[model samples]
Target chain A: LGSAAVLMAVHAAVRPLGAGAEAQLRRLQLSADPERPGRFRLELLGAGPGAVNLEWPLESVSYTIRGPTQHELQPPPGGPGTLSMHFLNPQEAQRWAVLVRGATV
Target chain B: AAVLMAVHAAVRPLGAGPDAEAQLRRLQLSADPERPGRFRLELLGAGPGAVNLEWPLESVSYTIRGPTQHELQPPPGGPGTLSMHFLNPQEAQRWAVLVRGATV
Candidate 1:
């Protein structure tokens, strides 16, 4: 048997810019956790800036994050587009967050 | 004299090859005292790749030959017919006739 749930939050914030251009920033948040004993948390973000909020119900297995990012934010060659994170034997009822920032395009 | 003659006749064609010995080992014969001259020779494994000949007389005898060897032969390719038989012969025949004639 398998189970899945999705939570989506769309927020927009405005920051004042004195000399430079003031851009409208939007953020999307998702909270994912598995209900049974198996691998679960998988989040895919479009070609944009976003974040992940991971919650684990069990600590036996782990969670990993990896994806692509735009190049202009890093300047020069900007390195690879992917970003990855891995967590092992996490404590149950633990929560984690990943923050990604990029100028609105 | 008959037993010796039969045994000699039977054993004369020995040491041909392992294949022939294998074939002879699979030979079977049966007779009844009342049946006298009537005997039956059965070749147990004589289908598909082998040929079996049965001759019965005062003593039954059987000769089996292996399948002929050939070169690499391309197999026939195409869809074959799918026939169905039903206990209800009338309905089955009607359906077969309709389907064979390209009728819907």
Candidate 2:
């Protein structure tokens, strides 16, 4: 019943559009922690010229497919942050959504 | 030129092989019933010829590798060409994607 088993690591980014004038697009990586077994890791690279990591137990996360090329991930009603992913293909996007859903189930 | 460079840097290269490869009739990805979350890729009329292969998704990465190329081998030929890649631990496996015209 772990979603980590199916979801592959995805290359995405933090789009800087609405954040602020100084905001710059940051590189993102979504992956399951092999060391931790069932935890999902979302890391933002070089945001501070350093990396920031977030970890969530598989069951604590939820995701929605915003569109064919975009997905939004959040935790419970109010959590620290939300991760949105932009993909190159619809199929890849859908597959990631399915796996993310499977993890919460 | 800076804008062009920025756009170029954003695109990642896909590892699919040669352009002359045969087109696949269809491609399907399904979860394995015996192993939940595990998936398989089925290729019909592909370069390796019609067959089903156990796609091991564990410890692997994926990317949208290619687009549909029209009429690969001509009449009596396959639908077109489109593929995806499974970036596993030791190797990268490229598989075709099923387009609208593909019956498989």
Candidate 3:
């Protein structure tokens, strides 16, 4: 649960863009991690097929991608799970998506 | 070369045990002539040197890989061999490796 909370924070930092751009961003941000002050580190690690670990400052969320891809949303901070950012424009949204992977925080 | 492509599809509902049977069904469905570029689903046992569940293909017959072997393994009598053949070896090799580690 705690891990999920931290992952939510990370997700809040990304998402909101559409899919076309999202694919390219996924490859680019595959190594990205959350380093926000006062926030837990959200790390996406994999051991093998059908095995994954989303390590959060508080707890860890682990699961498998049984198929190809999965989709999720990071809740806004202060509201419930993590911080949230509003998209001021399409470019901003796309950029954010590029930086973020499916919300794991 | 035909530039062949394939898709490997897999799925297991949240909080559910592995569904090798269902995963195989999905593989067959995707490989159906109508779909093209699909592969079959095979399940392997959990033991030393067991072949990984990843196969070279264009796309997965299913869409989601569960979080663990317990989550990906099929029930009794379910498909229990994890292997497939792709028309395009390159695409198959790429996706096979991707599927091997793309759970959760």
Candidate 4:
């Protein structure tokens, strides 16, 4: 089913840079999307929960979402409420996490 | 207020039809206390009105493969009568109304 909740599928490495300055840095991923033109389907290679969970602000911050990309993502094969994801490259995956973490929602 | 253990909602009353018994059973079967803040819903009767369970909830899961895929959609309209289980009678009276689509 098509839903507006669909974000992007990332395949990148993510590393938590401890507290403060290391984390607060404006590390947002300003990548451009050729398929959707202004979207991305990034995947954090070899990732887990932290990759899926983001504190994407709803009020304190603002973010933009665009049309679906040429690369369509299937909902979890299980029933509804089911989800599946994967990624690669350790800290490389971490980078992608930070990108979306600061993403204005 | 204290949290409730279980409750039920049914559009069908006892012996109301061939579907009432099963409808009550539907609510009866959903009494699983496995997790915190989890509500288990079931449908043991027939008729679209016999269909229980309100929509737009939190922490939802699936048991029958992908029964409508954990639909967040509401079931249109219904009689909205239901039931529940609790340590008290008044509590049951209160929750039954709230569970059937009460705001807040």
The Cα RMSD of model 2 versus the native structure comes to 13.8
**lDDT tens digits, residue span A3-105, model 1:** 5543333332222222233434333233234454322233333323344332333232222222112111211122223223222312100112211110000
Candidate 1 residues lying further than 4 Å off, grouped into runs, are: A1-105, B1-25, B29-37, B45-49, B57-104
lDDT of 1 at A25: 39
Compose the digit string of candidate 2's lDDT tens values, residues A8-82.
445554443334334234444455656666455544455432344445555666666778677766654434455
TM-score of model number 3? 0.21
Candidate order (TM-score): 2, 3, 4, 1
DockQ of model 4 vs. true complex = 0.01
Q: Name the weakest run of 10 consecutive residues (lDDT summed) in model 4 chain B.
A: B62-71
True interface contacts reproduced, per candidate:
0.00, 0.00, 0.00, 0.00
Question: Regarding TM-score, does 1 or 4 come out ahead?
Answer: 4
Residue B33 lDDT, candidate 1, scale 0-100: 37
| DockQ, all models | 0.00, 0.04, 0.01, 0.01
TM-score of each: 0.15, 0.40, 0.21, 0.18
Instruction: Report the lDDT of model 4 for residue A21.
Output: 25
Query: Candidate 2 chain B: worst 10 consecutive residues by lDDT?
Result: B1-10
Chain B, candidate 3: TM?
A: 0.27
| lDDT (10s digit) by residue, model 3, range A1-105 | 122122111221223333312221221112213443323333433311354543343223222211122333333232123222333343323322322323323
* Ranking according to DockQ, highest score first: 2, 3, 4, 1
lDDT, candidate 4, at B5? 25
Q: Which candidate number maximizes TM-score?
A: 2
Q: Candidate 4 - CAPRI tier?
A: incorrect
- Candidate order (lDDT): 2, 3, 4, 1
